[PDB]
Paper text:
PA4063 crystallized in two different forms corresponding to space groups P41212 and P65.
These findings strongly suggest a role for PA4063 in zinc trafficking, possibly acting as a metal chaperone or as a regulator of a transport system.
Numbering used by the authors: 19 to 96, 121 to 179
Amino acid sequence: GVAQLNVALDGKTLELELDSPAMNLVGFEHAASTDADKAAVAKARAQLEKPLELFALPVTAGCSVASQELRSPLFGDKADIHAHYQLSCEKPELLKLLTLAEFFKRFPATQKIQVQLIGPDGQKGADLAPASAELKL
């Protein structure tokens, strides 16, 4: 139950890249057949489309979404989910702490998240888990 997250904080710009097996987010590795499959896909799509909620960005930072991409056949019009987010924060000084607590609540099949961070300070790695879901930005 292992996802990657790449974070990049340069000034106003916050970039988030999630790479996860479909299993963690949707509950299965096939394309969507049954009603129960189509409803799990739609629940995951709706959640991944609200990144300020899923990554619990603090409202005080003034974060807004400039772009977001879901790359998977599950989310196209016709075995890995990629989710790319470009955010812009009016007060990025207030981004002190990234919490994946909400990601773990909304996708409880995710047991561990490997985070890479890149910032004016350099590169930083951490393994996050429901137990310790926080990372100093």
